[PDB]
Each structure stands twice: as structure tokens, then as C-alpha cells.
Amino acid sequence: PFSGLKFKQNSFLSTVPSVTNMHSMHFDARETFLGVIRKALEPDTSTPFPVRRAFDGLRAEILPNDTIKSAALKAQCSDIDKHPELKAKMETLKEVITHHPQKEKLAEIALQFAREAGLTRLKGETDYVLSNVLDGLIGDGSWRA
């Protein structure tokens, strides 16, 4: 579906929080982590225009920066079977994530968020969107156990 999709190397680096930031009482691990992944999914300029436009729309809808929108999506996904369109979009994005050229680094960052900010503390009860992103990075889903 996204033929020719390439990503901008290190596009997410400046968005990765410091361990100190992760320890802040005001730090939102889930929203921040999804924001890091959204930045990592920035298309490389060599990506054909039609593809760039469609992919930007998908990553923005599934990983909104606005927290009110993010919360609204989370609520909808609690009954994901009622939203075929969102389900299709999540599965499509998860598939793209499994082939990310810097997936290894993104998974290490996810594990850092896990250890320093409790990102994966809900284990298998982790919400739909975050679970699919984490499974995209760590295929065996072992982050749950």
C-alpha cells in the first residue's frame, strides 16, 4: 500500500526524552512515547508524493499529537470491533512499523520508557493502540511478560 515509503533517518532523536524528563510527575509516558513513534514515521522526501500524503494522514490520525484527540481515539479503540476503519488503519500502521529501518533503536527506546516511566506496566491490559505499536516494534509481544 505504501510503495516507495522511506523514512527520514533519526527524525525522532530530538523527541526522545531524557531519563530525568521520564521521571517527572508531569510526564505522560504513553502520549510521549506515541509522539516519538509518530516522529520516527516521518516520510523521507524521496517518497512519492501520493504515498507521503496518504501515510502522513494515517500516522496523524492514529498518533495524534493533541492529547484530547489521543484520548478520544483511545476511548473508541476500547471497543475496536465497532470501528472497522480504525482497526484496518492500526493494522496497516503496525505492519509499516515492523519494517522500520530503525526498529531496533525504537524498540530499545520503548524498553527505556518501560523501565523508567512504566510504559508497559499494564502488560496485556495495555490499550489497543499502544499494544499494536509495541507489537510492531517487538514482534514476540514479550514486552507484556
UniProtKB/Swiss-Prot annotation:
Disulphide connectivity of cysteines: none
One GO BP annotation of this record: positive regulation of neutrophil chemotaxis
Superkingdom of source: Bacteria
Family per similarity comment: Belongs to the SipA/IpaA family.
Primary role: Actin-binding protein that interferes with host cell actin cytoskeleton. It stimulates actin polymerization and counteracts F-actin destabilizing proteins. Potentiates SipC activity; both are required for an efficient bacterial internalization. In vitro, forms a complex with host cell protein T-plastin increasing actin bundling. It inhibits ADF/cofilin-directed depolymerization both by preventing binding of ADF and cofilin and by displacing them from F-actin. Also protects F-actin from gelsolin-directed severing and reanneals gelsolin-severed F-actin fragments.
Keyword annotations of the record: Actin-binding, Secreted, Virulence
Organism expressing this protein natively: Salmonella typhimurium (strain SL1344)
Protein name: Cell invasion protein SipA
Cellular component GO terms held in the UniProt record: extracellular space
Location relative to the cell: Secreted
GO MF annotation terms: actin binding
Primary subcellular site in the record, as a coarse category: secreted
UniProt key word Chaperone: no
Stretches the record annotates as Actin-binding and polymerization: 1-145
Subunit structure: Interacts with human PERP.
Key word Secreted present: yes
Shown segment, full-protein numbering: 514 to 658 of 685
